[PDB]
């Protein structure tokens, strides 16, 4: 009775432009949000840059030809705005669009689907310096881009994904100060997380014009699944409150137009810059929903967030090195109320994966047996999902290869492919090795 799954099912690993290409300064390539950010003291937890991170600019067939042994039938990859117009908008730069072609090209001659996701955090500094995120002319900033890119590559490229993770882009960037530009405002984050719902939608009907009937698009959305401490009252409106802010601040507006009403008021309705016909916008029609999964998050009512006045509970169980709660049932949970909920015709997990402290053994290989654990439950959710008639799709790793993990730098490990900093080596892990028998039985043995 072996666990197989639908006959077309895109098998993937995913990675950001910013996280695995380094050449920074290579071909007119301009200072990105990041390559400023990494700059600040504190900023990065081993003080390290994405300067060189994996070389994937100089060595992308290399990875490509691994990715034939891992047997993927699709990679997940991000562009870099800085490359194809680094003064933000403007001249087109042609060596950076050749490198994407090039990319592309290799991909699809090696039978390899690819997944561009048009914006994964890595604006243009010049282009930052006029519009952040938090200032509505960026929106037009981004459709110039998508335009440019998506003309010259959308006869190759059918599935595009418009921005990753708007929660992360806005709180992580303008709420907490933890990722590029690192500032830390309620009302910055709010204009940001609007402005990045605002920009999804603008850019849909932008990439199916430069596309065709086949051109398929969605946004990327990280959801946790959320968990009240305590069946008490004031602990299941701290997880209320946290829910909203993470999953449904992203989910209602897309599906339903609106913002949730309880954390709407909670913050102040006036924050939030919604001019008439923003919601006919975010709401345009898309082909899928893209979600990235990792971990359960337990809540209490607190004071370790003021913004929200919640506290985190760790259940006993099994954590990665990032000190995230391992909970594949989350996996399942959250699909099916997106299922249920908001009736996505197509679903894909575009990033799930764990970072556990890797060691090279004498024989130079990685066993990484939690690692592979943790995949092996995720895609037993994933499949339980398909069996209750959930249009999941597809599947993408976090990540082909260990990359530069944002403010945690190189000290956190994501790859089913380890990487030697020192020498570039590719070395496929034993998870890596298992996932090269599931993606060509398509299934789990
Ligand atoms: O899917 N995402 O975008 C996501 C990834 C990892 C997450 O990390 C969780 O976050 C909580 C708050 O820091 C922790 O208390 C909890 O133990 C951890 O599992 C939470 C959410
Ligand atoms: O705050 N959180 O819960 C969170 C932070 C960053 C996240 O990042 C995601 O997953 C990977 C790292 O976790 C990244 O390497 C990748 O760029 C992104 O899609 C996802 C979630």
Not at 241 to 264: I, S, T, V
Request: hydrophobic residues 40%; glycine residues 8%; proline residues 6%.
């Amino acid at each position: 009775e072996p666990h197989r799954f639908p006959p077309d099912f895109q098998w993937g690993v995913a990675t950001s432009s910013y996280q695995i290409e380094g050449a920074v300064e290579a071909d007119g390539r301009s200072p990105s949000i990041w390559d400023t950010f990494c700059a600040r003291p504190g900023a990065i937890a081993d003080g390290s840059t994405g300067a060189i991170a994996n070389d994937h600019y100089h060595r992308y067939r290399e990875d490509i030809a691994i990715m034939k042994q891992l047997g993927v039938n699709a990679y997940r990859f991000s562009i870099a705005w800085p490359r194809i117009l680094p003064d933000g908008r403007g001249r087109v730069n042609q060596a950076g669009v050749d490198f994407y072609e090039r990319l592309v090209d290799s991909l699809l001659e090696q039978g390899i689907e690819p997944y561009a996701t048009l914006y994964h955090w890595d604006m243009p500094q010049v282009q930052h310096d006029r519009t952040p995120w938090y200032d509505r002319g960026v929106v037009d900033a981004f459709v110039e881009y998508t335009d440019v890119i998506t003309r010259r590559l959308s006869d190759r490229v059918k599935y595009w994904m418009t921005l990753n993770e708007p929660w992360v882009i806005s709180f992580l960037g303008y709420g907490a100060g933890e990722h590029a530009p690192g500032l830390r405002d309620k009302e910055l984050y709010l204009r940001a997380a609007h402005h990045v719902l605002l920009a999804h939608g603008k850019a849909m009907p932008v990439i199916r014009a430069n596309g065709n009937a086949q051109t398929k698009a969605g946004i990327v959305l990280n959801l946790n699944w959320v968990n009240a401490a305590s069946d008490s009252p004031e602990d299941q409106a701290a997880a209320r409150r946290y829910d909203q802010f993470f999953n449904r601040w992203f989910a209602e507006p897309l599906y339903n137009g609106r913002y949730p009403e309880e954390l709407l008021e909670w913050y102040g309705r006036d924050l939030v810059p919604v001019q008439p016909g923003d919601f006919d916008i975010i709401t345009t029609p898309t082909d899928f929903l893209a979600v990235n999964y990792y971990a359960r998050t337990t809540v209490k009512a607190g004071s370790t967030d003021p913004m929200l006045q919640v506290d985190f509970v760790r259940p006993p169980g099994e954590y990665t090195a990032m000190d995230w709660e391992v909970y594949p049932q989350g996996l399942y949970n959250i699909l099916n109320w997106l299922h249920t909920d908001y009736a996505p015709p197509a679903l894909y997990v575009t990033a799930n994966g764990a970072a556990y402290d890797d060691q090279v053994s004498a024989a130079g290989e990685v066993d990484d047996p939690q690692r592979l654990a943790y995949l092996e439950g995720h895609f037993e959710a994933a499949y339980r999902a398909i069996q209750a008639g959930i249009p999941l799709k597809g599947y993408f790793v976090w990540s082909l290869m260990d990359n530069f993990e944002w403010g945690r730098g190189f000290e956190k490990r994501f790859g089913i492919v380890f990487v030697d900093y020192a020498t570039q080596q590719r070395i496929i892990k034993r998870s890596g090795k298992w996932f090269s028998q599931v993606t060509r039985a398509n299934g789990l043995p």
